[PDB]
Design an enzyme around this catalytic site. Structure first.
Site, PDB file in Angstrom:
ATOM      1  N   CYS A  15      -7.931   2.383   8.510  1.00  0.00           N
ATOM      2  CA  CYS A  15      -6.533   2.008   8.557  1.00  0.00           C
ATOM      3  C   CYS A  15      -5.836   2.519   9.822  1.00  0.00           C
ATOM      4  CB  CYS A  15      -5.817   2.596   7.354  1.00  0.00           C
ATOM      5  SG  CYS A  15      -4.087   2.171   7.345  1.00  0.00           S
ATOM      6  N   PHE A  69      -8.244   5.330   3.161  1.00  0.00           N
ATOM      7  CA  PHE A  69      -7.892   4.586   4.361  1.00  0.00           C
ATOM      8  C   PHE A  69      -9.073   3.860   5.047  1.00  0.00           C
ATOM      9  CE2 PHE A  69      -4.399   7.730   3.936  1.00  0.00           C
ATOM     10  CZ  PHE A  69      -3.303   6.874   3.921  1.00  0.00           C
ATOM     11  N   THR A  90       0.842  -1.178   0.000  1.00  0.00           N
ATOM     12  CA  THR A  90       0.000   0.000   0.000  1.00  0.00           C
ATOM     13  C   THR A  90       0.894   1.251   0.000  1.00  0.00           C
ATOM     14  OG1 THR A  90      -0.160  -0.299   2.383  1.00  0.00           O
ATOM     15  CG2 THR A  90      -2.060  -0.979   1.062  1.00  0.00           C
TER      16      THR A  90
HETATM   17  C1  HEM Z   1      -0.841   4.466   2.072  1.00  0.00           C
HETATM   18  C2  HEM Z   1      -0.770   3.276   2.669  1.00  0.00           C
HETATM   19  C3  HEM Z   1      -2.022   2.546   3.208  1.00  0.00           C
HETATM   20  C4  HEM Z   1      -3.265   2.439   2.676  1.00  0.00           C
HETATM   21  C5  HEM Z   1      -3.797   3.051   1.361  1.00  0.00           C
HETATM   22  C6  HEM Z   1      -4.071   1.639   3.584  1.00  0.00           C
HETATM   23  C7  HEM Z   1      -5.416   1.322   3.407  1.00  0.00           C
HETATM   24  C8  HEM Z   1      -6.233   0.620   4.269  1.00  0.00           C
HETATM   25  C9  HEM Z   1      -7.656   0.334   4.124  1.00  0.00           C
HETATM   26  C10 HEM Z   1      -8.545   0.778   2.951  1.00  0.00           C
HETATM   27  C11 HEM Z   1      -8.045  -0.389   5.193  1.00  0.00           C
HETATM   28  C12 HEM Z   1      -9.455  -0.952   5.506  1.00  0.00           C
HETATM   29  C13 HEM Z   1      -9.641  -2.287   4.749  1.00  0.00           C
HETATM   30  C14 HEM Z   1     -11.026  -2.885   4.933  1.00  0.00           C
HETATM   31  O1  HEM Z   1     -11.967  -2.150   5.356  1.00  0.00           O
HETATM   32  O2  HEM Z   1     -11.184  -4.106   4.652  1.00  0.00           O
HETATM   33  C15 HEM Z   1      -6.876  -0.596   6.027  1.00  0.00           C
HETATM   34  C16 HEM Z   1      -6.837  -1.282   7.209  1.00  0.00           C
HETATM   35  C17 HEM Z   1      -5.708  -1.588   7.929  1.00  0.00           C
HETATM   36  N1  HEM Z   1      -4.399  -1.204   7.641  1.00  0.00           N
HETATM   37 FE1  HEM Z   1      -3.851   0.210   6.186  1.00  0.00          FE
HETATM   38  N2  HEM Z   1      -3.272   1.291   4.673  1.00  0.00           N
HETATM   39  C18 HEM Z   1      -2.004   1.810   4.458  1.00  0.00           C
HETATM   40  C19 HEM Z   1      -0.907   1.703   5.290  1.00  0.00           C
HETATM   41  C20 HEM Z   1      -0.801   0.873   6.375  1.00  0.00           C
HETATM   42  C21 HEM Z   1       0.377   0.631   7.188  1.00  0.00           C
HETATM   43  C22 HEM Z   1       1.782   1.284   7.021  1.00  0.00           C
HETATM   44  C23 HEM Z   1       0.017  -0.254   8.115  1.00  0.00           C
HETATM   45  C24 HEM Z   1       0.933  -0.788   9.214  1.00  0.00           C
HETATM   46  C25 HEM Z   1       0.519  -0.521  10.454  1.00  0.00           C
HETATM   47  C26 HEM Z   1      -1.383  -0.602   7.941  1.00  0.00           C
HETATM   48  C27 HEM Z   1      -2.135  -1.504   8.667  1.00  0.00           C
HETATM   49  C28 HEM Z   1      -3.510  -1.713   8.611  1.00  0.00           C
HETATM   50  C29 HEM Z   1      -4.274  -2.468   9.602  1.00  0.00           C
HETATM   51  C30 HEM Z   1      -3.784  -3.218  10.863  1.00  0.00           C
HETATM   52  C31 HEM Z   1      -5.722  -2.385   9.144  1.00  0.00           C
HETATM   53  C32 HEM Z   1      -6.945  -3.012   9.848  1.00  0.00           C
HETATM   54  C33 HEM Z   1      -7.441  -1.967  10.846  1.00  0.00           C
HETATM   55  C34 HEM Z   1      -8.582  -2.498  11.657  1.00  0.00           C
HETATM   56  O3  HEM Z   1      -9.523  -3.059  11.047  1.00  0.00           O
HETATM   57  O4  HEM Z   1      -8.554  -2.341  12.908  1.00  0.00           O
HETATM   58  N3  HEM Z   1      -1.833   0.110   6.859  1.00  0.00           N
HETATM   59  N4  HEM Z   1      -5.813   0.048   5.447  1.00  0.00           N
END
Ligand code: HEM
Ligand SMILES: [Zn+2]
EC number: 1.14.14.1
Length: 455
Positions: A400, A393, A268
């Site tokens: 996220c 996000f 991502t």
């Molecule tokens: C620009 C970079 C990133 C984008 C575009 C992004 C995008 C997203 C999106 C759209 C979701 C929700 C997915 C869903 O609803 O099924 C999500 C969840 C998540 N992302 Fe990111 N993310 C990014 C960077 C990161 C990074 C660096 C980490 C490392 C910590 C991370 C960890 C997570 C985690 C653990 C979730 C689940 C959160 C939860 O449901 O409690 N992401 N992300």
């Protein structure tokens, strides 16, 4: 009243499925949305999904009292190694809420200050590597950014150095993770899952899960046994306690969270940086203005936390790259109860809705008619941006957790790139977007001519 929902070309008893046979499903889905509009029904053998493309409907779908996060088939296949980590858990698993509250303070803007120095550490390796290329050579952009993001998360997450920038062949853990992720995606389009031809695929999969588990389990066990307190997320995860049980996360779950951070964050973030740079070289006026801000702001040998925050335009460029190509392009929801969406579309309890982020970000009623233009200035006034209009996000409590992390990382890295080199689109690269769990510009390459500024 009840409106009938459009539905794309059907192929008999195969329904709409042959339309997602392609290696670019999201892009295929966007074209259908361009033709069918804000909502359409997608039918598969035994399965029904509705695709949402407009702010009007997505806004409503993001009401968390009516809709909750659904585990798509992709996340269910990923769960085989990410277990009950944050990204692959149902909201109502007790491990979802427990990890969420424990880890939230570790991911605030404020926590970014503690990660700053470790992020700069991997960024300098990036910069120094580019400085040492011969004029002869070029940069494989998404490959180098992925090297950088994996290692930054490795170091920031569990004080581990994969040393990706100093090896041809990747660290065994990374080879296994990459391979294990690809298999889980390849399984989505797989015809006969129990066919004997996939016996080796099945065998490699378990080997790769074991490689991943062995390392992360060993790392946690060693930190526990050593009895030493440290900066990172690992220490925070070992000591942080659930207010109502008094118990911290178990060792297996911590392993899940660490695997999760690697998988969730690595491509991502690198996709973002690869698409930012793609747009910058295609848009020389924007490059120029962002390069001017980097030279103006980054007055020290190495950037400070405070200096990254004053990189407003670079932040705007990252948001606009995220508007056009959100790197995790879709997220899935289910109706908690029987309900009606947009006052025209009745929903059964449990019905799936898929938010299509790249179409949301092209809603002309929100953004105007220049939606295909790269224009970071769209983001000068953040209050001008309507609620639920810009969602790269995710949504609400299932948004996220690494949003601050990804953005600090990318703002810092892009700033440093713009300060230290001039970039040539030497191939006149044609945008080709590869789709896996995430999006990236496949084959994107540039040359970087150093400005000879020391670190
Ligand atoms: C620009 C970079 C990133 C984008 C575009 C992004 C995008 C997203 C999106 C759209 C979701 C929700 C997915 C869903 O609803 O099924 C999500 C969840 C998540 N992302 Fe990111 N993310 C990014 C960077 C990161 C990074 C660096 C980490 C490392 C910590 C991370 C960890 C997570 C985690 C653990 C979730 C689940 C959160 C939860 O449901 O409690 N992401 N992300
Ligand atoms: Zn019903």
């Amino acid at each position: 009243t009840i409106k009938e929902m459009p539905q794309p070309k059907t192929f008999g008893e195969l329904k709409n499925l042959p339309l997602l046979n392609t290696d670019k499903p999201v892009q295929a889905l966007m074209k259908i949305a361009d033709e069918l509009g804000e909502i359409f029904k997608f039918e598969a053998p035994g399965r029904v999904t509705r695709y949402l493309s407009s702010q009007r409907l997505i806004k409503e779908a993001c009401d968390e009292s009516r809709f909750d996060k659904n585990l798509s088939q992709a996340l269910k296949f990923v769960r085989d190694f990410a277990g009950d980590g944050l990204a692959t858990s149902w909201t109502h698993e007790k491990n979802w809420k427990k990890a969420h509250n424990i880890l939230l303070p570790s991911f605030s803007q404020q926590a970014m200050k503690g990660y700053h120095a470790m992020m700069v550490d991997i960024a300098v390796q990036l910069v120094q590597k580019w400085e040492r290329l011969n004029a002869d050579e070029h940069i494989e952009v998404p490959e180098d950014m992925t090297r950088l993001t994996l290692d930054t998360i490795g170091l920031c997450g569990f004080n581990y150095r994969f040393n990706s920038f100093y090896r041809d062949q990747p660290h065994p853990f990374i080879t296994s993770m990459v391979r294990a992720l690809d298999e889980a995606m390849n399984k989505l389009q797989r015809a006969n899952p129990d066919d004997p031809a996939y016996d080796e695929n099945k065998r490699q999969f378990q080997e790769d899960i074991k490689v991943m588990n062995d390392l992360v389990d060993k790392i946690i066990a060693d930190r526990k046994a050593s009895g030493e307190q440290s900066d990172d997320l690992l220490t925070h995860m070992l000591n942080g306690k659930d207010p109502e049980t008094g118990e911290p996360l178990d060792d297996e779950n911590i392993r899940y969270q660490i695997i999760t951070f690697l998988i969730a964050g690595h491509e991502t973030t690198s996709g973002l940086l690869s698409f930012a740079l793609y747009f910058l070289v295609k848009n020389p006026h924007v490059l120029q203005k962002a390069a001017e801000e980097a030279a103006r702001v980054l007055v020290d040998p190495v950037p400070s936390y405070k200096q990254v925050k004053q990189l407003k335009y670079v932040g705007m460029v990252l948001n606009e790259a995220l508007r056009l190509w959100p790197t995790a392009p879709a997220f899935s929801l289910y109706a908690k109860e029987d309900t009606v969406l947009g006052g025209e579309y009745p929903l059964e309890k449990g019905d799936e809705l898929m938010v299509l982020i790249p179409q949301l970000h092209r809603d002309k009623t929100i953004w105007g008619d220049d939606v295909e233009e790269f224009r970071p200035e769209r983001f000068e006034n953040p209050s001008a941006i309507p609620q639920h209009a810009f969602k790269p996000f995710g949504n609400g409590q299932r948004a996220c957790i690494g949003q601050q992390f990804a953005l600090h990382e990318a703002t810092l890295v892009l700033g440093m790139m713009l300060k230290h080199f001039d970039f040539e689109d030497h191939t006149n690269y044609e945008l080709d977007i590869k789709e896996t769990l995430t999006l990236k510009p496949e084959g994107f390459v540039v040359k970087a001519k150093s400005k000879k500024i020391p670190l």
